[PDB]
Amino acid sequence: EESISLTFRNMNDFTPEQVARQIPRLKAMLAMRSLLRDLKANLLDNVTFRKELEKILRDPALSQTLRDELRALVPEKAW
Ligand SMILES: [Cl-]
Ligand SMILES: [Zn+2]
């Protein structure tokens, strides 16, 4: 799926501090999903995969907890 959704379950979710955490997180998740699909469909080699991965996870607005969950999705043979 080429798409992702930010769901607001209350009005307090629209707070600029909440939007600023949620937008880069969802962007990293969608970029990661596309990159893993590219790798699994053999559309890019391991060297390109690792270069793109580092770009995705470089976003300073991401939590290290999220980066860890994203890196845990990488198949062992792509390292
Ligand atoms: Cl999470
Ligand atoms: Zn989690």
Automatic annotation (TrEMBL):
It comes from the Bacteria. Zn(2+) binds at E69. This is Type VI secretion protein. The lineage of its organism: Bacteria, Pseudomonadati, Pseudomonadota, Gammaproteobacteria, Enterobacterales. The chain holds residues 88 to 165 of 165 of the full protein.
